[PDB]
Amino acid sequence: GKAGISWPAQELTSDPIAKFFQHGSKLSWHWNWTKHWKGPLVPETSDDLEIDAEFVPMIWSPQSLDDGCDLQEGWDLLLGFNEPDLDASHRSPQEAADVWIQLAQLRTDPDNQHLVSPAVASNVEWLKEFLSLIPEETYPTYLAVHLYTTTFDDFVGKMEMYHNEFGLPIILTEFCMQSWDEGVPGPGDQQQVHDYMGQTTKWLDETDYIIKYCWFGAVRDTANLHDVHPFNRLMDEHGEITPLGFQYMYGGHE
């Protein structure tokens, strides 16, 4: 399946997400905005924790390349900088393109490793300029996308814009039922979020240029929602899977 889990490294331990990949789960991957899920970057994770799923590391910002920590061994995909367009660690497209040359060196085994673009918060021009400035031999295979909207029609139009603008297959690393437009109201009730997840996951499973996707909302601490509506939660304050989490983990849609 295409469906993954995001987990904030602010939680300090990867243990709580093991239960998303238990008997019957349809979820196939996970990421955490950083290099590894067991190690100094998630330092409280139990030594013996096993997560039977693909981990996708991220180079969060230019500084992460110099942090002296290692990428999760055996990675297949590497994600570029998180929301470098936001004032995320803010860079110009040229500052990002220069650091990209150093990041792209991590692809030492190019038959079994592929690079994914930086994901912008919103600035499509930022990403167009970035991709035009990097050397062609470093061009990412996949586009990373963050899409926060509240209606299925708007979701599909924006996904189609990213596909049409950039012409790469897509890894949707962050989505849920939330608009950062302030004239756009957040979900009215919990049911609307179940409905949104059903519609979006069916469309994403049926669209061949969607390689992977990842709902935003597996967290324990409310702080780690970053003002996302708590109706988007896949996990509660105690580390237990919510009804929305159950829907997601068992395939999102019939």
Which residues, in sequence order, are bridge partners of residue 146? 174
The residue nearest K ion at its CB is 112
CB of 212 to K ion, least distance (A): 15
Tokens 């909207």 found at? 149
Q: Which is nearer to K ion, 102 or 112 (CB)?
A: 112
CA distance 106 to 108: 5
Q: Which residue's CB is nearer to K ion, number 76 or number 237?
A: 76
How far apart are the C-alpha atoms of 75 and 55, rounded to whole Å?
7
Summarize as ranges the residues that interact with K ion (CB under 5 A).
76, 112
Task: Specify the residue, 76 or 160, whose C-beta has the smaller distance to K ion.
Answer: 76
Q: How far is the CB of 245 from K ion (least distance, A)?
A: 28
CB nearer to K ion: pick between 76 and 221: 76
Closest separation in Å from C-beta 83 to K ion? 26
Least Å distance, CB 118 to K ion, is: 21
Min CB(30)–K ion separation in Å: 16
- 57 with 36: CB under 8 angstroms? yes
**Nearer of residues 22 and 112 to K ion, judged by Cβ:** 112
Q: Which is nearer to K ion, 76 or 181 (CB)?
A: 76
Nearest approach in angstroms of CB 166 to K ion is 24
